[PDB]
Design a protein around this ligand. Structure first.
Ligand SMILES: C[C@@H](O)[C@H](N)C(=O)O
Length: 390
């Protein structure tokens, strides 16, 4: 009746870049001033997001719409990355893909013009007080029924021969499902790899067995790894408070961090009826799942090795603050039974953890402190809960 886990503070893994979501004031309503604070502030009742994703509009007359939310996110400590869905229409042409006509791609003779479009966006945002952390070549080049397709080889040509001219960190390829065929050619080409800064991926339908990426472990030194878009487990209307469904969000984040070694996890729309912030501006159950990571695992913390699945239905991750070697552990219990775990943290001088617990009936509730016996922290997880220990 007593499971065990070990957190090894000397086995450092990836440095955390942060957590957040998407704003898109052209497709939906912009975040309001108060919602910006709820998203990117880290007070009580705020999500503590540290990454904002925006879109690069094909029409430069829409670019000003991004500025207010991006400025406020940066002021509150976030970084901003931008992704394009289509080039300007004068750079696009059509082709027939798997027998479906009228599909879009970037004209091969416009790759330089496209570099200039992306640089123009970067310069416009810079002039408006938004120094982009990164810009992407293409959102979901491999699921572009409704936008612009790129084959692995088109992406490679761009990364190899053009991306070095972009005045920003370059993100690629943002496959819809982290399909490795989209990114392998970049990693295997020294020049394309040199021009890459961030390997970006989405997680739609990505299973745990597909989260590791051996080639990236081998070839990705100096490159960041970001999961730049998902919603899970669905986008059902008015689903954001569904319980225990919302536990799937925490589990997907656990998996990104521990199974994928991801440094960033970015939702789709921040404010939506299936998102982390509801249309009334309050945090949803799905949002509290994100918050268990985002409020506590701050940028610059480093994930460390920790028993990831100490007993059935229990999932554990741990990240260290290198300033003082303190630890943040996020523990999910999907069981209908409470679980007691002896968590060994050998070599720590820390002797007390505070904890915050979300269940179907409470949100980030501060509960009784855990007092260690030596280097062991005995914790009890309520059924169907997430706990962050700090
Ligand atoms: C076997 C099952 O009934 C068990 N007693 C439980 O904890 O739910």
């Amino acid at each position: 009746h007593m499971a065990s886990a070990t957190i090894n503070l000397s086995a450092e893994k990836q440095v955390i870049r942060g957590f957040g979501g998407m704003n898109h004031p052209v497709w939906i309503s912009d975040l309001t001033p108060q919602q910006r604070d709820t998203a990117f502030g880290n007070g009580e009742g705020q999500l503590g997001f540290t990454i904002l994703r925006i879109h690069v509009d094909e029409n430069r007359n829409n670019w000003s719409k991004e500025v207010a939310t991006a400025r406020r996110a940066i002021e509150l400590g976030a970084i901003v990355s931008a992704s394009p869905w289509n080039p300007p229409s004068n750079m696009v042409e059509t082709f027939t893909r798997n027998g479906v006509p009228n599909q879009k791609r970037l004209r091969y003779d416009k790759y330089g013009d496209y570099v200039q479009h992306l640089n123009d966006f970067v310069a416009y945002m810079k002039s408006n007080g938004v120094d982009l952390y990164a810009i992407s070549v293409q959102n979901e080049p491999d699921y572009a029924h409704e936008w612009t397709w790129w084959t692995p080889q088109e992406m490679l040509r761009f990364m190899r021969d053009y991306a070095g001219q972009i005045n920003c960190r370059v993100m690629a390829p943002e496959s819809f499902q982290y399909l490795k065929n989209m990114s392998d050619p970049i990693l295997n080409d020294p020049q394309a790899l040199a021009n890459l800064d961030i390997l970006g991926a989405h997680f739609y339908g990505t299973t745990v067995n597909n989260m590791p990426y051996p080639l990236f472990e081998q070839k990705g030194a100096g490159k960041e790894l970001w999961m730049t878009e998902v919603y899970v487990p669905n986008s059902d209307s008015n689903s954001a408070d569904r319980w225990p469904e919302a536990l799937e969000v925490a589990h997907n984040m656990h998996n990104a961090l521990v199974e994928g070694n991801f440094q960033a996890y970015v939702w789709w729309y921040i404010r939506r009826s299936y998102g982390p912030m509801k249309e009334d501006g309050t945090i949803s159950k799905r949002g509290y799942m994100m918050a268990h990571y985002s409020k506590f695992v701050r940028p610059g913390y480093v994930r460390v090795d920790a028993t990831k699945n100490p007993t059935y239905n229990v999932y554990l991750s741990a990240c260290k603050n290198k300033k003082d070697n303190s630890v943040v552990a996020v523990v999910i219990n999907k069981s209908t039974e409470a679980k007691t775990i002896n968590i060994s943290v050998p070599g720590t001088s820390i002797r007390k953890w505070e904890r915050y617990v979300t269940t179907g009936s409470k949100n980030l509730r501060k509960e009784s402190d855990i007092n260690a016996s030596g280097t062991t922290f005995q914790v009890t997880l309520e059924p169907q809960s997430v706990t962050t220990f700090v």
